[PDB]
Amino acid sequence: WRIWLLFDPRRALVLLFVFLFGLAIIIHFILLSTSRFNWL
Amino acid sequence: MWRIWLLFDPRRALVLLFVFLFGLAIIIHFILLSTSRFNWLDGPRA
Amino acid sequence: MWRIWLLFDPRRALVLLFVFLFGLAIIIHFILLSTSRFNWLDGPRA
Amino acid sequence: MWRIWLLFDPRRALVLLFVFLFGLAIIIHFILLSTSRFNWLDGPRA
Amino acid sequence: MWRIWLLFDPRRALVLLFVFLFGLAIIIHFILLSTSRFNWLDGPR
Amino acid sequence: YQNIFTQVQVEGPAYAGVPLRPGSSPRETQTTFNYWLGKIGDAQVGPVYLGFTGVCSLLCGFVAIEIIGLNMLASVDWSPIEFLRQFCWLALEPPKPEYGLTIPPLKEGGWWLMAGFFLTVSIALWWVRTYRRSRALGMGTHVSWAFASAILLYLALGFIQPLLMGSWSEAPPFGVFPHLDWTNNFSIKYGNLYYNPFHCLSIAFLYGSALLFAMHGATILAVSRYGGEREIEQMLDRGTALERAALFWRWTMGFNATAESIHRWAWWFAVLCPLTGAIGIILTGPVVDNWFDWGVKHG
Amino acid sequence: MQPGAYLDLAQVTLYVFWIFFAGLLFYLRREDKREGYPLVADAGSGTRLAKIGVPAPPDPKTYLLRGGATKTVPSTSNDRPNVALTPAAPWPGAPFVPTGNPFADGVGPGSYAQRADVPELGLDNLPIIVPLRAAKGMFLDPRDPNPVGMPVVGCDGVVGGTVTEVWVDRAEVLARYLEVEVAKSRKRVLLPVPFALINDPFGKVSVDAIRGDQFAGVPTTSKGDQVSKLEEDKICAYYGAGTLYATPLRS
Amino acid sequence: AMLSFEKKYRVRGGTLIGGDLFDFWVGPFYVGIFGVMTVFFALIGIALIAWNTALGPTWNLWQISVNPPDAKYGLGFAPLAEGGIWQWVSICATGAFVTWALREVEICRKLGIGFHVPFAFSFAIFAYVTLVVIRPVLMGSWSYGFPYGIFTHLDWVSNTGYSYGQFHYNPAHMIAITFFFTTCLALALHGGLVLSALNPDRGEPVKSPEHENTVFRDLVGYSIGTIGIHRLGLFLALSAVFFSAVCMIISGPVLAEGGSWPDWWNWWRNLPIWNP
Amino acid sequence: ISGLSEAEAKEFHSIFVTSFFLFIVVAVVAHILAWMWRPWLPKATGY
Amino acid sequence: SISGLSEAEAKEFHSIFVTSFFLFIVVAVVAHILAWMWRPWLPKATGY
Amino acid sequence: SISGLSEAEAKEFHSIFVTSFFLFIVVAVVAHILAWMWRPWLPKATGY
Amino acid sequence: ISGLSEAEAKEFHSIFVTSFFLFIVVAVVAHILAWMWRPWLPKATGY
Amino acid sequence: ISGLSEAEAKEFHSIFVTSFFLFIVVAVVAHILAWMWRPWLPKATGY
Amino acid sequence: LLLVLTAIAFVATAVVARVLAASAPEGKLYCQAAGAASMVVGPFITLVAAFVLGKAGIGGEVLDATAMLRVAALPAFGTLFVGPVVFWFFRRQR
Ligand code: BCL
Ligand code: BCL
Ligand SMILES: CC[C@H]1c2cc3[nH]c4c(c3C)C(=O)[C@H](C(=O)OC)c4c3nc(cc4[nH]c(cc(n2)[C@@H]1C)c(C(C)=O)c4C)[C@@H](C)[C@@H]3CCC(=O)OC/C=C(\C)CCC[C@@H](C)CCC[C@@H](C)CCCC(C)C
Ligand SMILES: CC(C)C/C=C/[C@H](C)C/C=C/[C@@H](C)CCC[C@H](C)CCCC[C@@H](C)CCC[C@H](C)CCC[C@@H](C)CCCC(C)(C)O
Ligand SMILES: CCCCCCCCCCCCO[C@@H]1O[C@H](CO)[C@@H](O[C@H]2O[C@H](CO)[C@@H](O)[C@H](O)[C@H]2O)[C@H](O)[C@H]1O
Ligand SMILES: CCCCCCCCCCCCO[C@@H]1O[C@H](CO)[C@@H](O[C@H]2O[C@H](CO)[C@@H](O)[C@H](O)[C@H]2O)[C@H](O)[C@H]1O
Ligand SMILES: [Fe+3]
């Protein structure tokens, strides 16, 4: 809750969501880069 | 050292530090992954 | 020598010093990684 | 000679001098590192 | 000859003279360094 | 709404223009209004002052164009059918190498030499006309000195570099596709023009002029709602429009121009494109004959 | 240098150009600093010495005007330094918040410059922006729609007034302002053409920057057949304020 | 710090995302969320370029080159040391350009002006994307993108042009060159005209837009005016870039790679009007 | 600061930590599945 | 102050900041121990 | 009047600055000693 | 008086001179060590 | 005019001449050392 | 065949997106874990569906883990998109 005295969640949440989505995309593309983990 | 927060606003300094740390982590992970010895996904070129 | 902070804003000076030190450290690390003798990731053939 | 500070803003002159000194230092270091004899990382074969 | 500083602002004149001097010194050093006789880093070869 | 077009176009009398100094002649009186011109810009299509230098410039230029066209017609046996078929491939070719800098036979570069002479005289007369049209209104001669840069590139291409090489055969032909082929073979014959540094600089300044004129046009259209297009008045008496433009660019990239210095930036980029071009052409062959070898020698 | 040397004419010419071009960039960046200097230091900065930058601004430049008059730039009197704004935070770089009504204060997108309170005289020493009733010989070119008569409507759909006259620029034939008889107070206010959609979408001309009632607050010109540069900035600024501060409850 | 007149405009609001978290300035620069993102992308890209150079033979600035993947990888992700760094530098670059355009949009909203500058920048972004994404995808492998090197992407331009005979005969390319040369001409003309009116001959007053109209008439034949010139300049630059992008799209996806642009023009020489 | 009460901070923090731990559980299960598919971190020779 | 924090609030924030920084450092340390157990870096002048 | 601060503020900031700078330099010196133990630089004119 | 007073100029200049001198002596030590490592200025035939 | 009184002018000029002269002396010593290291100006047959 | 058959993924994603679009308690929870969860719940749905219908051979064939992953990739990717657009009817309700 102490973090919520900063970073009012009405805007510090969609940023976290796009960050998580971007990180997931980066890791998936890194996996597709390899041969062992290219699941296609 | 607590005096550093009389100079810099903690919200923006904290968010900027987080962006910096994430970028540094991304770069070090890429650098490790580009080598042969530290490619933890495919292993060495052999 | 404390008089320097009567010349320069210590806040802006602190941020500039941080940026400059980080840039220099990154430059030196990349220089070493480009050499063969001091590359510490893959090793002595580069 | 101290009168030169009645002409030039000492903050601006001093940051100019620091930028110039750092630029000259990295330029001389890079020049030496590009030669074979004075390269101190890989050594004399360059 | 002191009257030249009535013609030109000593600040601008002095900055311009310093820029000129440093540029000329750099150019002469690089010219010498590009020759084979006067290259003091690697030497005549 | 944005100012790409004018919604309401007012129409009134034809403007005769600013009265001139007592050193010119009465100008034309065409002063017609085209609707689409006013749609994209202003609508008046006159009156074009055409004095001595303008008339002699057009006469010399049309002498050159007549020579070129009659040679392209003769090279095709006067067939208008074959002229229309082969038009983009026809050219008055430069003299042969065996003639050096002499006046060669007409069919072996004499006609080319005469057309080039008359085109150069036409272009110099047009430059003099720009100079006089500016200084007859009391204005600066910045446009004339921007034109002089293009003229310097054109002279280097057709006159100066052929001089320093000692042969008119170095110069371009007078034809569309043939002068494209000349450009290509010039790059091929002298190494690779991508390793000519002044060629790199000329390309930098051409790209930068495109970039700068996109930036400036977009900036003026963005603040045109605040009266931004009146640049002279916004410089003499700064309004909120030029303040907003300066602030846009200062917040975007950290630095901005004024209403006048942006046009100095523009002038200098556009001028440095053909200046560096002319230098790089004068260097290509008299000084450097293989640019890739030079680049390897340096980087 | 000599044919075999590492130094040759091409690279000497290139370094000559690099020197000339560094000098030219300095000169251009110096010309850029003829307005807006010295800098205004922000919170936490010593204000004793001026902030200018590494190309210092040049000496003030003096332009000669037609009637023997004279204008020296920078136009420091146009700055409006102190306005109705308060810092949203004590740290440097923090934005400001309008303390009062940003339409009347002239802050943010609604800011204007303290221009000369006199019209532009063009070439014949007469105001160039004039009502069509005052510029005889010009006409609206009926090829396009005629704004006059159309009642102007706000952004929230409320009719604001009626278009009475079209103000045009002389010697650059162009419509600059629409005169608007406000709704029911018998007052005429100017409306910049770029801030209006004079197309007759349905029957009228529509302005989406401010809403219908706000046409009462548009800054009025002191004369009737001429508008000064100051009033020009004030009107365009009143309309620009709506781009950020009106949003007439159209949600 | 601020310009002497800037304080009026440094107001809160006008952002797209994030609210007031990034609504501030760092010196001259406005930050916004997209400014942080742009610096992030630019710095990750520059660091990947530096790393690719550290793996390479030289630090020479002219010979630095981040090369695209081999054609054997087609349109898939290549290993990081065999072309993947190029793909990631490309992703970082397109991210940087897009967030830069968006930050310009935010600044436009905060100042209350039109969005012509981000719109015009989108054309350069589109040309870059055509070069590194659209064209190699249409041609089936990332090996058709240009290498990120000061003088190796010039070699790429040379090889790409010469693979179609002589690239000068590319018609969209001729149109694009005409537009670029006209843009440079118009920039010189406009700059010189405004500088002539503002800095006149000795003893003369600052001239008016009427003198500019007069001299522009005497040179080009007619007049476009103060807003027409900026419109025409925007249009010329944007159409130059658009026809460059078209030029590149039609060569390799449309005209085969080993094709000939000089030979494509024979359709005109071979018309029945004059062929037999 | 932020216009968020201490009590409102705690009441949002409740659902925040719950959905955060739900996300963590799903990620951990996805990783167990991925490892059972193909393990990573080989030895200096290979898999 | 410049940031607008009273020294009470500055000290309060700094306590949590150093706590978080030290937890971050401890996690990074165990991560580096694990990474070394997987692949040691810093080879000999001849190689690994 | 000075460029921003008072001698009290300047001296306080300088105390903290010198402490931080000294510990930063000490860490750097330890780093360089370890680096030299791993790989000495500055070879002879013939090589290593 | 392009910004400063006489006293401030003298104080700044004294500090500037002493720190410039410290910079010079540190650089002289640096060059003595560099020369001990590898001398420059070869003979006209080489090293 | 540069906005400088003749007293300021003479002061600046005296200091400038002193500085220029010290610079010349240093440059002369440098050129003597350089000549001792490598003489330029060969004969028409070379060094 | 399984590929075009695995529209179980799309319909189940539409179902869960409709559910959480109706069950989104308050406003501005679209910007919250309603549209976001509607995006990521999809690939898990298609994963479990492919796992259940690849063991039980439906396309006349039984698949491994690798073959099942290669097959179910594209439905997962299209589901990553069909989630949010089906959920968007939440805000399209109010
Ligand atoms: C033969 C080569 C020898 C060597 C022989 C010498 C000799 C001889 C000398 C040095 C000197 C120096 N050497 Mg050594 N040195 C060697 C190897 C190194 C290595 C290395 C990684 O190997 C490093 C890091 C150094 C570093 C140094 C510096 C401590 C010092 C440079 C002076 C200076 O910093 O001016 C810069 C001074 C400033 C005040 C600049 C301050 C910058 C400020 C803060 C603002 C800059 C803003 C900046 C532009 C912002 C952008 C930053 C970027 C992001 C990076 N050397 C090798 C072994 N070295 C010199 C010295 O000791 O001088 C005292 C010297 O004379
Ligand atoms: C295979 C081809 C070669 C090449 C060979 C050359 C050659 C040769 C030249 C150039 C030149 C240029 N090249 Mg190149 N160039 C190449 C690749 C490129 C690429 C690219 C993306 O690859 C680009 C962007 C460019 C761009 C450029 C320009 C920067 C530059 C032209 C300046 C200019 O504005 O001229 C426009 C201005 C003029 C042409 C002169 C103005 C003409 C006069 C003033 C107007 C008279 C009109 C007349 C009166 C009308 C009636 C006449 C009658 C009808 C006849 N080149 C490759 C490497 N390039 C020129 C240059 O300067 O480089 C050093 C040049 O000479
Ligand atoms: C800053 C450098 C750029 C530049 C600048 C520039 N050009 C200029 C000027 C300036 C500042 C003028 O003031 C002058 C002018 O009058 O502009 C309207 C001009 C000019 N630049 C012109 C052309 C031109 N500029 C070119 C290039 C450039 N000009 C550079 C990119 C090119 C190219 C790229 O090839 C051309 C073809 C003319 C329109 C004009 C000079 C007119 C002239 O000298 O007339 C001589 C008279 C005759 C030859 C008689 C016949 C006239 C007609 C043939 C005119 C046709 C014009 C045009 C349609 C030709 C196009 C090519 C043809 C092959 C179809
Ligand atoms: C004593 C000597 C030594 C002095 C002379 C010395 C001079 C100084 C020489 C200088 C010569 C140099 C400077 C010239 C440079 C050459 C130019 C760079 C040309 C390059 C580009 C040219 C083409 C793109 C244009 C060709 C024209 C067009 C294709 C044809 C037009 C003709 C027909 C259509 C007219 C239809 C008409 C009909 C026949 C119907 O009636
Ligand atoms: C209008 C623009 C400015 C006016 C003109 C600018 C140049 C004026 C001076 C030109 C000087 C003559 O320049 C000189 O030309 C002669 C012949 O022409 C060349 O002389 C030689 O050129 C080449 C060398 O391989 C051969 O063709 C031949 O052996 C010989 O002609 C010189 O190499 C050149 O230096
Ligand atoms: C929550 C985030 C989840 C992110 C999930 C990641 C989704 C997958 C990203 C798309 C990756 C596709 O990756 C790539 O796609 C192209 C486009 O068809 C495939 O197809 C391509 O095959 C060959 C080369 O492989 C090309 O010559 C051909 O023209 C093209 O069809 C590639 O073989 C595949 O390697
Ligand atoms: Fe303009």
The DSSP annotation for G221-251 comes to PSSSS---HHHHHHHHHHHHHHHHHT--S--
Task: State the smallest CA–CA distance between residue G42 and chain B in angstroms.
Answer: 14
- Which residues, 6 or more positions from F43, have their beta carbon under 8 angstroms from its beta carbon? F9, F11, F33, F34, F35, F37, G173
| Contacts of H133-141 spanning 24+ positions with Cβ under 8 A | H133/H90, H133/H94, H134/H249, H135/H248, H135/H249, H135/H252, H135/H253, H136/H68, H136/H75, H137/H75, H138/H249, H138/H252, H138/H253, H139/H252, H139/H253, H139/H257, H140/H74, H140/H75, H141/H69, H141/H71, H141/H73, H141/H74, H141/H75
Distance separating alpha carbons of residues A2 and F35, to the nearest angstrom: 67
**Radius of gyration of the CA atoms of chain G, in A:** 25
Q: How do beta strands G85-87 and G96-98 pair?
A: antiparallel
CB burial of residue C18 (10 Å; 0-12, 13-18, 19+)? exposed
Distance separating alpha carbons of residues H248 and H262, to the nearest angstrom: 16
Distance separating alpha carbons of residues H6 and C22, to the nearest angstrom: 32
DSSP letter assigned to residue F246: H
Give Cα N53 distance to the centre of its chain. 15
Distance separating alpha carbons of residues F268 and F212, to the nearest angstrom: 11
Dihedral in degrees, nearest 10, Cα atoms G244, G245, G248, G251: 60
Evaluate: CB of F199 within 6 angstroms of ligand 2. yes
Which ligand has its closest atom nearest to the C-alpha of D37?
A: 1
Distance separating alpha carbons of residues N84 and A17, to the nearest angstrom: 14
Task: Judge whether G113 and G233 are in contact, CB under 8 Å.
Answer: yes
Q: Which residue numbers of C have CB closer than 8 Å to J's CBs? A: 11, 37, 40-41, 43-45
Q: Which residue has the tokens 């109705």?
A: G84
What's the Cα-to-Cα distance from M8 to each of E11, G118, G247, M11, rounded to whole Å?
13, 44, 61, 5
Give Cα G75 distance to the centre of its chain. 14
- Which residues, 6 or more positions from H168, have their beta carbon under 8 angstroms from its beta carbon? F177, F180, F181, F183, F184, H174, H261
Distance separating alpha carbons of residues D30 and D25, to the nearest angstrom: 9
Which ligand has its closest atom nearest to the C-alpha of F161?
A: 5
Partners of H11 in the beta sheet? G96
Peptide bond just before E44 cis, omega within 30 deg? no
Q: Which residues surround ligand 7, an ion (CB under 5 A)?
A: F 231
3-state secondary structure at position J2: coil
CB–CB of E44 and L44 under 8 A?
Answer: yes
Distance separating alpha carbons of residues G212 and H161, to the nearest angstrom: 59
Atom of ligand 2 minimally distant from the CA of F122? 49
Q: Which of F117, F200, F201, F203 to mutate to test the pocket of ligand 2 (most atoms within 8 A of CB)?
A: F203
Dihedral in degrees, nearest 10, Cα atoms F205, F210, F212, F213: 140
Contacting F residues, span 130-189, partner chain G, CB-CB under 8 Å: none
Distance separating alpha carbons of residues H116 and H113, to the nearest angstrom: 9
Tokens of F1: 């709404």
Task: State the smallest CA–CA distance between residue J46 and chain K in angstroms.
Answer: 11
> Experimentally, how was this structure solved?
cryo-EM
CB burial of residue B45 (10 Å; 0-12, 13-18, 19+)? exposed
Q: Is J32 annotated as a binding residue?
A: yes
Residue in chain D closest to E13 (alpha carbons) equals D7
Q: Residue F12: what residue type?
A: G
Partners of G192 in the beta sheet? G177
H helix or E strand, kind and range, residue G82? none
Contacting F residues, span 41-100, partner chain H, CB-CB under 8 Å: 41-42, 44-49, 81-82, 84-86, 88-89
The 10 Å CB-count burial string (b at 16+, else e) for N60-71 is: eeebeeeebbeb
Outline where chain I has alpha helix (H).
6-37
Evaluate: CB of F155 within 6 angstroms of ligand 2. no
Strands (E), chain F: none
Between N65-87 and I6-37, two packed helices, what is the crossing angle to 10 degrees?
A: 150
Distance separating alpha carbons of residues H151 and G205, to the nearest angstrom: 56
φ, ψ for residue N32 (rounded to 5)?
-115, -165
Outline where chain G has alpha helix (H).
9-31, 102-105, 229-245
Distance separating alpha carbons of residues B36 and H171, to the nearest angstrom: 47
- Ligand 3 center to residue H60 CA distance, Å? 41
CB burial of residue N33 (10 Å; 0-12, 13-18, 19+)? buried
φ, ψ for residue G190 (rounded to 5)?
-90, 150
| Ligand 4 surroundings by CB, under 6 angstroms | F 65-66, 68-70, 73, 113, 116-117, 119-120, 154-155, 157-159, 171-172, 174-176, 179
Q: Between chain D and chain L, how many beta carbons pairs sit less than 8 Å apart?
A: 33
Distance separating alpha carbons of residues M12 and D30, to the nearest angstrom: 39
3-state secondary structure at position B45: coil
Interface residue A37 vs chain H (CB under 8 A):
no
- Which residues, 6 or more positions from B42, have their beta carbon under 8 angstroms from its beta carbon? A34, A35, A36, H79
Terminal alpha carbon distance of chain D: 46
Interface residue N32 vs chain I (CB under 8 A):
no
H helix or E strand, kind and range, residue G120? none
Task: Judge whether H120 and H238 are in contact, CB under 8 Å.
Answer: yes
Q: Which residue numbers of I have CB closer than 8 Å to N's CBs? A: 19, 26, 37
H helix or E strand, kind and range, residue D33? helix D10-34
Outline where A1-40 has alpha helix (H).
14-33
φ, ψ for residue G101 (rounded to 5)?
-95, 110
Residues in chain J: 48
Distance separating alpha carbons of residues G3 and G10, to the nearest angstrom: 12
Q: Is K41 annotated as a binding residue?
A: yes
Peptide bond just before F47 cis, omega within 30 deg? yes
- Which residues, 6 or more positions from N50, have their beta carbon under 8 angstroms from its beta carbon? N2, N6, N68, N69, N71, N72, N75
Evaluate: CB of F183 within 6 angstroms of ligand 2. yes
Evaluate: CB of D16 within 6 angstroms of ligand 1. no
φ, ψ for residue H20 (rounded to 5)?
-100, 10
Q: Which residue has the tokens 């365009």?
A: G236
- Ligand 4 center to residue F178 CA distance, Å? 12
What's the Cα-to-Cα distance from G121 to each of F241, H194, L46, rounded to whole Å?
19, 18, 78
Domain limits of chain J? 1-48
DSSP string, F173-236: PBSHHHHHHHHHHHHHHTS-GGG-HHHHHHHHHHHHHHHHHHHHHHHHHHSGGGTTT-HHHHHH
Task: Judge whether H199 and F139 are in contact, CB under 8 Å.
Answer: no
DSSP string, N48-72: HHHHHHHHTTSSSS---HHHHHHHH
Distance separating alpha carbons of residues B5 and A39, to the nearest angstrom: 48
- Ligand 6 center to residue B25 CA distance, Å? 27
Strands (E), F28-163: none
Distance separating alpha carbons of residues H266 and H275, to the nearest angstrom: 10
Terminal alpha carbon distance of chain G: 75
φ, ψ for residue N55 (rounded to 5)?
-65, -60
**Radius of gyration of the CA atoms of chain A, in A:** 16
Tokens of F150: 């293009």
DSSP letter assigned to residue H66: B
Tokens of G207: 């302005």
Task: Judge whether G210 and G248 are in contact, CB under 8 Å.
Answer: yes
- Which residues of chain K lie closer than 8 angstroms to J45, CB-CB? 39, 48
Evaluate: CB of F147 within 6 angstroms of ligand 3. yes
Interface residue B5 vs chain C (CB under 8 A):
no
CB–CB of L38 and D37 under 8 A?
Answer: yes
Q: Which residue has the tokens 């580009």?
A: B34
DSSP letter assigned to residue D8: S
